[PDB]
Amino acid sequence: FGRFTERAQKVLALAQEEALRLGHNNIGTEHILLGLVREGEGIAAKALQALGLGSEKIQKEVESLIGRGQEMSQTIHYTPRAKKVIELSMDEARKLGHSYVGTEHILLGLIREGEGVAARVLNNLGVSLNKARQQVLQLLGSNETGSSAAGTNSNANTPTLDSLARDLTAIAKEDSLDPVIGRSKEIQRVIEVLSRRTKNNPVLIGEPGVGKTAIAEGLAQQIINNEVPEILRDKRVMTLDMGTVVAGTKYRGEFEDRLKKVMDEIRQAGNIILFIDALHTLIGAGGAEGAIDASNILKPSLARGELQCIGATTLDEYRKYIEKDAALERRFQPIQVDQPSVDESIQILQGLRDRYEAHHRVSITDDAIEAAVKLSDRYISDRFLPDKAIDLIDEAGSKVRLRSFTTPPNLKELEQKLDEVRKEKDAAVQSQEFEKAASLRDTEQRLREQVEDTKKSWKEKQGQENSEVTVDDIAMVVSSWTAQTETDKLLNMENILHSRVIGQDEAVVAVAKAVRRARAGLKDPKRPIGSFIFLGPTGVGKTELARALAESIFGDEESMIRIDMSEYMEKHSTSRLVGSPPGYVGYDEGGQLTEKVRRKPYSVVLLDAIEKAHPDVFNILLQVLEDGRLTDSKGRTVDFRNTILIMTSNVGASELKRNKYVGFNVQDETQNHKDMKDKVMGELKRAFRPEFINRIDEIIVFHSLEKKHLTEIVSLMSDQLTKRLKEQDLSIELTDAAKAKVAEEGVDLEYGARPLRRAIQKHVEDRLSEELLRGNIHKGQHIVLDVEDGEFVVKTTA
Amino acid sequence: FGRFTERAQKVLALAQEEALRLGHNNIGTEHILLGLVREGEGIAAKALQALGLGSEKIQKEVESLIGRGQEMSQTIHYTPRAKKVIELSMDEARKLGHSYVGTEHILLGLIREGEGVAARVLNNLGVSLNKARQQVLQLLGSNETGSSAAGTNSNANTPTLDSLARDLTAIAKEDSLDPVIGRSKEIQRVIEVLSRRTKNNPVLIGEPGVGKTAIAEGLAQQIINNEVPEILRDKRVMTLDMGTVVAGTKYRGEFEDRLKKVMDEIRQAGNIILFIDALHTLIGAGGAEGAIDASNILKPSLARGELQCIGATTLDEYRKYIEKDAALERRFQPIQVDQPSVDESIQILQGLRDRYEAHHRVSITDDAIEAAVKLSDRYISDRFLPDKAIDLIDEAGSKVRLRSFTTPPNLKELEQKLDEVRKEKDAAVQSQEFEKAASLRDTEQRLREQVEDTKKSWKEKQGQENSEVTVDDIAMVVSSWTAQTETDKLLNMENILHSRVIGQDEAVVAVAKAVRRARAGLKDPKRPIGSFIFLGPTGVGKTELARALAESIFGDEESMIRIDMSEYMEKHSTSRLVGSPPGYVGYDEGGQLTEKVRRKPYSVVLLDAIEKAHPDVFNILLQVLEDGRLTDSKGRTVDFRNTILIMTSNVGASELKRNKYVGFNVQDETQNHKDMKDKVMGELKRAFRPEFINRIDEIIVFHSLEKKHLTEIVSLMSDQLTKRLKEQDLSIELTDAAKAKVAEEGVDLEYGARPLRRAIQKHVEDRLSEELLRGNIHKGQHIVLDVEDGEFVVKTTA
């Protein structure tokens, strides 16, 4: 039902006692009622005893019902009536100060459900339903136990400390104050700044937003025992809570007045610590609106150090307060608030991990924690390092906890069946159709037990799967977003990149391995997952791999940035004029490159044809390649952390486009291979500076046809064909038998490689469409245009 | 009289029984009254029997009104009295919770209609009208029908469930709400997210706009029966829904406070699931302004795992929450939600067909759905895949149902007469003018019946027509906007393109058929539905076809975007289209091309002069043709889906200007045809960079004239001639003989047939106008340019 204590449950179970003992085959509210009076000295029972009802008195009425009875007590469970009462009471005990459920609450809950079996039992045994709830109630209430109140055993403090406000020291006497998670060196660092009084205030600057407040609670604790100096010893800690300070008078003027009142009482000689949150706002410096200019009072008080205070200030705002002068900053002092970096991340995860067992399957395993962090860093995305983490851990740790209970095969189908019956049955009884309902009822109960037995027979599937939550689990979950499906993308990357790369087995494998290394959790996360320079030809080379990489790692062809370096041979912006240039490398930094990768920090950054472009532009790109950042535009830091940077180039192109053929011998395959496997890496060095090339994982080499890179261009256009009809309905393929025959038409010596789209168009597309309009193919079928007899044939494969 | 209960309708028809039985030829309320008291055990009847009125008592009065009576009962229908009583009863039923109006309500309806036939019957039989309505009320008029008394159980629920809101758990107990449509494996994938609590929130990302809420209703069901985790044994789903919260509160601060209360009740921790609909609005991040940043409360609540929630964010928004940090991603987690793609579309169509049943034309057919879907996808193509679809089926799904019943033999003329009568008759009857009315009345009812028989005579045309909404029906309707008669626009494309093109028989058939190929299905919808190069002379074929293509395929002449790629060169746009720092290649990527085509992604994109245009431009153009998309404008996707990219090319002209002369020789002309239709697609290739232009579907070559062509060009000029004067309200026509004499001026070896507009201007426009100005014809009569003796002749005919 929920969560209950004994006392409750006992009155309920006494109902079951009555199930067989009174023969109430399913036990109504009356048995629950009897239950209440029958635990004797339970608060419900006691109430009923006030009304004069003994276990007897209830039971006599109760016995006048079924009368001991159907002692088979078929379906020896509750009734729907009693199930309402139990559910009501439980919650009616939450309502009446009890997290779970107490005996009293069940009688009270009975009263609530005052039309049920209990209710009529009680209206037959005289006593009113509210007189009963009265009696239970007067054995609840008058709480104040486990609590009291205290100020400060000094309270020299009084005119201030009355007003205005909570004191961290006070609330920490019994310790009803949460840690909160650190930000641990910060708590130490607070005592550095706070046993100061011309740097009175530690001033916590960081993401708000992780829980700055954890650090603050730090101070309180350490002034007691014992990290603190003798300075911060012999002190009392008071928080300047903004709401009481503004008061019900609801003005800034009132806020200042109350804050002043604290400053006068500060006569404790700096032995009082006052906490001023958003101290910069109070200083009133920075912005076009200061947000009150308390700085005037605060400055001599802080400077004298009589006001010794605690600062919570915002990253930029804090600068814009110490700038104010001349002892304003003789308070605040900055301190790094922990927003977890990757190692720290792991530790945070772990700290609330075990508690993911409120929604079970996680915690466990260690490797998964590590994965959570690490796997996010290379695969998905710009997100914060512990947030990334914790999510994966829980994500997978649940994914599977359902797959337990989704493996009952799909014995959900059982549940489905039972419905059809009920219906049939019900409607049949309504006709009567007595026994014509009968068998349908019976058919139900067959089902009912069958259904339920196999949904919880896969509680064995819970003990089987439902904790393990590994790297693999975590990766699958990281992929959900985007080490199962983060390394399977990698491990089979080469296969995937080759199917949209035009040959160039060299290129595919080079990129494949470098990305597969980095993206599997083992390298290049700060910089691009692969920075690369690609020399090759085009359409039998480079671009097509840039596309294929975007597609495989990040999802979709068009998750690809694209900047032209030939414009960065700049002077296209003085008088030829090109998109919004402050002056062209300034365009790259100031807008184009940085904005685009900030937009997708999870994409193939494609810096096309770096080539003869200004080496200074390459220095700018070099910061991406090394650091994986640029800081530009408006002060944005653009995370190329989870990009794969691909720079194309070519000035070797011709050979890289010139075959690998048996053009005059088979040694023309194997030295043309070698020729291309040379031409990329030396035209690379000749194109631009080595410094550039040096922050590049691999030099991706693109070759050309044995027969074979050519026939892959045919298959790139033919694959654009195979892809394009499902959007309107229809599965199209040019069969490989035909992709070969279509490839036959792309040979001349003097012109090839390009005509292929068109010849696929004529011989496939055009041929299939002029046969589809006639009505030789139904919609949503698979259309293979094949060769079957050495000629085109449209065959279907659904 | 509406769709209402039988019991009502029965008292009404019983009036008709009294119509003939007492001879009250048209039935007043006494007969309705009689109906009421005579049905015995109807609530009205029973009431009247209380009041002391048996069928007898009423009928005695009724019989004393007429008795027997014209049993012929001339016009044996209702009259305004009885019809009012019915209208009234309905209102007397409205008040008693009956839209299905019953026996009581009519007796009640009588009461309403005091000093009427019922009413006076009752005031003669000593029964006061309100005592009668009383009597009915105190039987049926105290409705409590279908009582269950709502709710579930539970009481702890109070702070949450008070607020806000109809909980998912409630609606699935009796299954009182629609599923609606999933995304079923998604419901499983969501419950996975409810098996976790530090990635708590499944986050449904998709169009709003799908009926997403169906997946959410999913959860409820799977947590119940029965295979769901140990976690989700004790799970309850309680809803946080914004709409009720904002209503009657009208402040952001208060709204947030209510959301805080919702977060608080979650103390049932590890027993409760909270549904946050529009979780994205709450996150209040990723924009430049929030939508109320509740995220601050939700994120730590989720991290602690006390809150565990069901999230609906948005496509991009899931990123823009996971960015927020540092347990902001420990909230959201993505889930796949689809707006129906084309195959799904077919299923949507069919599913709601049966619900359009009150049209008897939607009904049917599989093929009709298929047409709707398939045709919509390629043609308009400006909406979404099932919506487009369902609209076509239904478009046709009346169009023909109207052709069923366009006019039953249009005796609306009959009615016109019957009117003339009404008047004639009326005014005669008004004077007396007795027999002078007689024949007029008689003429009236003569007419009247005559109307009605032929007004229902295309119910024989219903037994002929009354369903047909097949393929062709659908096609016609899509053509109405813009398989068979929309695909007749594709199949008969050549005919359509030639009629608004300057000859160019080569060009017309090539584009026509190539587009028709793609629009059948095969020839690339991912890519532009036609990529093309149009070579030849401009204005002498090219542009004019781009227009004509738009017209046949897309349904509008001027559904044509048009960008010049040569300005994107900056070669005639270093000084001509540019000034200040921003300029033209920036226009092409940055907005012009991408924005315009995103607006209409069903337009002829006409990319002017792409030979000598930027080599950078061609990389972009190639990307349009291949990928079918460009991603520019900082992340906008421009759908070159059912665009027809038409790239023009200056070169070719000379051969195209050579013609298939009637005489010159015979050898070279019919080989000049063959020469221009071949050589031109190769003058393209020699002029510039192949990779873009070959990765196009077809290379279209445009004549100028083909000698052969002239008399077709003149008839385009003549149609341009004849139309522009209609705007000013004059009808002119050139006879074909006269269009012929103009055609004489564009025969030609090498000069094409660009001169034909001008020569129509000189010999027609100018000539007719030089005859119109001189007062031979004056302002608003018909002007024929004829040839009669081989010479021009200006004729008048109006």
UniProtKB/Swiss-Prot annotation, chains A, B:
SUPFAM superfamilies: Double Clp-N motif, P-loop containing nucleoside triphosphate hydrolases. Transmembrane segments: none annotated. Residues 161-408 are annotated as: I. InterPro entries: AAA+_ATPase, ATPase_AAA_core, Clp_ATPase_C, Clp_N_dom_sf, Clp_R_dom, ClpA/B, ClpA/B_CS1, ClpA/B_CS2. ATP binds at residues 206-213, 536-543. GO terms for molecular function: ATP binding; ATP hydrolysis activity. Residues 415-450 form the UVR domain. Residues 469-653 are annotated as: II. It comes from the Bacteria. PROSITE patterns: CLP_R, CLPAB_1, CLPAB_2, UVR. Residues 4-69 are annotated as: Repeat 1. Residues 78-142 are annotated as: Repeat 2. PANTHER family: ATP-DEPENDENT CLP PROTEASE, HEAT SHOCK PROTEIN 104. Competence gene repressor; required for cell growth at high temperature. Negative regulator of comK expression. May interact with MecA to negatively regulate comK. This is Negative regulator of genetic competence ClpC/MecB. It comes from Bacillus subtilis (strain 168). The gene is clpC.
